[PDB]
Design an enzyme around this catalytic site. Structure first.
Site, mmCIF file in Angstrom:
data_model
loop_
_atom_site.group_PDB
_atom_site.id
_atom_site.type_symbol
_atom_site.label_atom_id
_atom_site.label_comp_id
_atom_site.label_asym_id
_atom_site.label_seq_id
_atom_site.Cartn_x
_atom_site.Cartn_y
_atom_site.Cartn_z
ATOM 1 C CB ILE A 36 -21.690 -4.749 -5.902
ATOM 2 C CG1 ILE A 36 -21.862 -3.464 -5.094
ATOM 3 C CG2 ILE A 36 -21.768 -4.465 -7.393
ATOM 4 C CD1 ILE A 36 -20.616 -2.645 -5.016
ATOM 5 C CG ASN B 132 -28.197 -7.961 -0.756
ATOM 6 O OD1 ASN B 132 -29.389 -7.667 -0.656
ATOM 7 N ND2 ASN B 132 -27.613 -8.197 -1.924
ATOM 8 N N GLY B 133 -26.685 -5.841 2.914
ATOM 9 C CA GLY B 133 -26.499 -5.732 4.341
ATOM 10 C C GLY B 133 -27.809 -5.935 5.081
ATOM 11 N N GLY C 155 -29.726 -2.652 3.813
ATOM 12 C CA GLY C 155 -30.124 -2.422 2.440
ATOM 13 C C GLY C 155 -29.184 -3.095 1.459
ATOM 14 C CB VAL C 156 -29.485 -3.750 -2.049
ATOM 15 C CG1 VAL C 156 -30.658 -2.799 -2.252
ATOM 16 C CG2 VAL C 156 -28.725 -3.959 -3.361
ATOM 17 C CB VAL C 157 -24.166 -1.580 -1.726
ATOM 18 C CG1 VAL C 157 -23.089 -0.878 -2.536
ATOM 19 C CG2 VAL C 157 -24.331 -0.914 -0.370
ATOM 20 C CE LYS D 111 -25.381 2.583 3.631
ATOM 21 N NZ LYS D 111 -24.384 2.390 4.719
ATOM 22 C CG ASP E 22 -19.068 -2.312 12.163
ATOM 23 O OD1 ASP E 22 -18.306 -3.152 12.689
ATOM 24 O OD2 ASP E 22 -19.975 -2.630 11.364
#
Ligand SMILES: O=C(O)c1ccc2c(c1)nc(Nc1cccc(Cl)c1)c1ccncc12
Length: 356
Positions: A36, A38-39, A42-44, A59, A153
């Site tokens: 759901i 992508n950063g 990593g991926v979530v 995460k 952030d």
């Protein structure tokens, strides 16, 4: 990990350590796993817990086992009902590589998505939602600041929302850090539009008041229907700031980064705030924006002082209900930790109709 296939549905079982409480790992099972997000880090995933049935976010983030993980340390310490909960964590595997997995609350919406709908419909978000969301953000900031932790952030994407309950969860503490006076900090945190002036100046001695600036930008964005200080570069952002706050004074430039005192600046005079927003904008909201978007960091309201601002008075009226008829979230159950920065403020925050 262990992969079953109950009724063909893929089931993952991991021995996961709980986030809060004592370090006692448990067998945990989940299914319905789908990506759901992508950063850069990593991926979530989203998944369904195989017992409670609840939805969760997972995460996955690469973990060089050389050092501890700062995000994990902060997330285990935090427990507040305006901050996404860390339910479990565990390690997995790309080759000869260890991944840290954080199992968090699933929250269906974000402030960014809600504001974009209203913006696409040429609609303004009703101020009751602006009060609700802004209040819960400031409360989450007052809680983490009490511990000396700066999120660094704050942005509308990072403010999760349940649209039925109107509850806000602050998320992504991957940029958070306990700010120690005198020790320097990396200056390239915080995302566009929401970067404080001292951060644009590359200052390394900034404080937690940068979270307050970003929150002021999110409030102004909710009132305006668009970001208040847009720009693809620092000069562009700074010009949009100067057009509102006016040119910073010599003293104000020294309060962010003295190393920028002699540089040349756009020489524009202060546009009065009331002319920044739509005509039907509540004056108490404009007042709060002015107190958060201050050049001098020490002059910005604290998150606790912001929660007590007159803009949030309608949240304290006993008759307040959600537009959909439900009750508002729990906005008054302040722990004494939350009130650390200023306990006397509790007479305003906790209203007479909410004590015992
Ligand atoms: O990092 C956290 O603390 C964190 C915590 C909770 C969520 C999250 C990140 N990311 C989500 N999704 C998402 C959406 C866009 C991009 C990326 Cl990378 C992830 C998400 C979705 C639904 N409920 C909770 C979360």
């Amino acid at each position: 990990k262990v992969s079953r296939d109950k009724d063909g549905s893929k089931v993952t079982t991991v021995v996961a350590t709980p986030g809060q409480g004592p370090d006692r790992p448990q067998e945990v099972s989940y299914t319905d796993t789908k990506v759901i997000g992508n950063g850069s880090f990593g991926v979530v995933y989203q998944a369904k817990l195989c017992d409670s049935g609840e939805l969760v976010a997972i995460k996955k983030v690469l973990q060089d086992k050389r050092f501890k993980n700062r995000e994990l340390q902060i997330m285990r310490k935090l427990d507040h009902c305006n901050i996404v909960r860390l339910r479990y964590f565990f390690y997995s595997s790309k080759k000869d590589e260890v991944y840290l997995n954080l199992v968090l609350d699933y929250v269906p919406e974000t402030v960014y998505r809600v504001a974009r709908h209203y913006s696409r419909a040429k609609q303004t978000l009703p101020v009751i939602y602006v009060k609700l969301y802004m209040y819960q953000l400031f409360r989450s900031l007052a809680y983490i600041h009490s511990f000396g932790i700066c999120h660094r952030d704050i942005k509308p994407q990072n403010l999760l929302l349940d649209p039925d309950t109107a509850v806000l969860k602050l998320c992504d503490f991957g940029s958070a850090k306990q700010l120690v006076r005198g020790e320097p900090n990396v200056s390239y945190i915080c995302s566009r539009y929401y970067r404080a002036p001292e951060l644009i100046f590359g200052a390394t001695d900034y404080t937690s008041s940068i979270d307050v600036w970003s929150a002021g930008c999110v409030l102004a964005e909710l009132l305006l229907g668009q970001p208040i200080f847009p720009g693809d570069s620092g000069v562009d952002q700074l010009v949009e700031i100067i057009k509102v706050l006016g040119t910073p004074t010599r003293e104000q430039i020294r309060e962010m980064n003295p190393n920028y005192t002699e540089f040349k600046f756009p020489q524009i005079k202060a546009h009065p705030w009331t002319k920044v927003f739509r005509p039907r904008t509540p004056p108490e909201a404009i007042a709060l924006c002015s107190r958060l978007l201050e050049y001098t960091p020490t002059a910005r309201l604290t998150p606790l002082e912001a929660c007590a601002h007159s803009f949030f008075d309608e949240l304290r009226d006993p008759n307040v209900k959600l537009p959909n008829g439900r009750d508002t979230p729990a906005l008054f159950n302040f722990t004494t930790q939350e009130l650390s920065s200023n306990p006397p403020l509790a007479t305003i925050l906790i209203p007479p109709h909410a004590r015992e």
